[PDB]
Amino acid sequence: AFRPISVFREANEDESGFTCCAFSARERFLMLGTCTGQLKLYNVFSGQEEASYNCHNSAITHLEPSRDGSLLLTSATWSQPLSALWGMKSVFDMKHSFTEDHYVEFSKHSQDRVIGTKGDIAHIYDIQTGNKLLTLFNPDLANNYKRNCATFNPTDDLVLNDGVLWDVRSAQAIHKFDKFNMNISGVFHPNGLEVIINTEIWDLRTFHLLHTVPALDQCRVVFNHTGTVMYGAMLQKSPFGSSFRTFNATDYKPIATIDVKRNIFDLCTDTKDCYLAVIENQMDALNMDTVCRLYEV
Amino acid sequence: AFRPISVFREANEDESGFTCCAFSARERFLMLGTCTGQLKLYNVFSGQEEASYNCHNSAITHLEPSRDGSLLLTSATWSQPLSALWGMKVFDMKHSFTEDHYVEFSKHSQDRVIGTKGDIAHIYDIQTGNKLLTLFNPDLANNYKRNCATFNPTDDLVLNDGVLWDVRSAQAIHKFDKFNMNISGVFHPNGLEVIINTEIWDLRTFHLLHTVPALDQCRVVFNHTGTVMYGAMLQAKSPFGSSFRTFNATDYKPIATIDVKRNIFDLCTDTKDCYLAVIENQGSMDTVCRLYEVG
């Protein structure tokens, strides 16, 4: 099940402005982005604010800490730059920024690269230099997904951008997956064998259709760290509706639907896959007044 | 560093017959199984025996207290039942697992027991004692001679005989190939890796990550933060030899080799990893429990 064990808001703000979250490398701490462009560190159990940093001059949409705790990616709404890489060692400082990329992720195996998305286009950057190594766009193969989000596979040898599979080493498109929806561009399964593009599950080896899972329509997905559970939430303002769903990652069978009856902004699980944090707005309310709810998994 | 503090010896015996050890949940006592099937509780502060319970009609091989202090698993050598579950809140037998020679609790939520009978895993409900699942796929068996089935940290997966199972679907996901005759493997507490003898496998992709020669024929246990792994090599009598090794749990690099110069039967640490208890043969049998400061 998912048992709520705590809730908190942005401390001492009239309107609580949490927009996104990720568990920090430090146990007991959650990092939260806010609608005024700040990064907050909270004790997730006590709900007390620890620290605050200034990142953007507009709402943070999404963030991702590196596994080693040294780096953080943020993206914002209408700032220039739209995304940035922060050091979180001795001093919190901007290392590099990614001009017009509205979404960024780390590489997965070795976190030495950042992949950013601008519309239909992927940009790959070196963390050390900040240099743009690659621009991935093929006019013949584009799907023009409206919510495209480029991503590396588990071993960093492949990229999925706009439903197109790229060999990173050669910088060549090797396969275009056919289009079935307007918005969702897809992710790699952590098993390294399958790609999940909206409702379609494709075999990475043969490019054959393995399964159709209608409940995944218009969902963003995240796996737990052990790769046993997949969380999906349907896109809707707030990014998501009021529900998320879990699936068995090993067979795509549904486990549970959780409807919190309030718009969801983000969801994350800790490295030990014991806790879920969900940002929820206090349906389709005009007032921004979010809370972070912590669930025991 | 492991600095010896003191020894618990079996009260009123010329030779001590301890075979296994665990700290109690709240850690006021050490729980020590014996070669005649008794469970003895020793006060850690005073060193004195506070209780002795008749658990099995053969030597206790292994035991595991539940984290909440309410339950204890035991396993024994011969006869029947080979394993049992005991209530710690009057001491009594709750359930027995007649043919399972090894048992463990589930890890994330301790509502289940997993037992091993040869190549077969059995999962039981703690409350009812009912067998919920039997996991065995003859297509995939490795027939490890010292197979011990185990849950992963989230309880979503089981490793049995080197085969990875999805518990929810009760389906074998993957067979890890066989490179030794005995050791069937464990999950790393980090949730990312499987440790099967000398092979470290990626849990998600199943690719080989590392070879760790020093782990050959070892049983392992981690500190409670999962930063240190203890390993002791089975004997080709004492289950282990006279040394154990510690390893950095993140990179599998050795930290220390501890030569006890006495054969080891078991070891355990407390929740805060301040203490290590080791069952050591002083004799040759005279198996005492030596307590060490960790460190």
CATH fold type of chain A: Methylamine Dehydrogenase, Chain H
User: Biggest interface: chains and residue counts?
Assistant: A-B, 21 and 17 residues
Strand fraction of chain A: over 45%
- Structural class call of chain A reads mainly beta
Number of strands of chain A: 28
Order of helices and strands of chain A: EEEEEEEEEEEEEEEEEEEEEEEEEEEE
Helix percent of chain A reads under 10%
The named CATH superfamily of chain A? YVTN repeat-like/Quinoprotein amine dehydrogenase
Please report the first level of CATH classification, the CATH class of chain A: Mainly Beta
Number of domains of chain A: 1
Radius of gyration based on Cα positions of chain A? 18 Å
What overall geometry of chain A do the principal axes of the alpha carbons give?
globular
Family (chain A): Belongs to the VPRBP/DCAF1 family.
Motif (DWD box 2) (chain A): 200-207
Region (WD repeat-like region) (chain A): 13-212
Protein name (chain A): DDB1- and CUL4-associated factor 1
Compact description:
Chain A: WD repeats lie at residues 13-52, 55-96, 98-135, 137-169, 170-212. The structure is a homodimer. By secondary structure, chain A is mostly beta strands.
Describe this structure in words.
The structure is a homodimer. With 297 residues, chain A is mainly β. Chain A has one domain: YVTN repeat-like/Quinoprotein amine dehydrogenase (Methylamine Dehydrogenase, Chain H, 7 Propeller). Helix content of chain A is 0%, strand content 51%. Chain A is built from no helices and 28 strands. The first copy, chain A, has strands spanning 3-9, 18-23, 29-34, 38-43, 48-54, 60-65, 71-76, 83-88, 92-98, 103-106, 113-118, 121-126, 132-136, 151-152, 158-161, 164-167, 172-176, 187-188, 194-197, 200-203, 209-212, 219-223, 229-234, 243-248, 254-259, 264-269, 275-281, 290-296. In chain A, the strands form 7 sheets. In chain A, strands 1-28-27-26 form a 4-stranded antiparallel beta sheet, with no helix packed on it. The radius of gyration of chain A is 18 Å and the shape is globular. The relative contact order of chain A is 0.13. The interface between A and B is medium-sized, with 21 and 17 residues. Chain B: The modification Phosphoserine is found at residue 238. Chain B: A motif (DWD box 1) lies at residues 163-170. Chain B: A motif (DWD box 2) lies at residues 199-206. Chain B: It is found in: Cytoplasm; Nucleus; Cytoplasm, Cytoskeleton, Microtubule organizing center, Centrosome. Chain B: Belongs to the VPRBP/DCAF1 family.
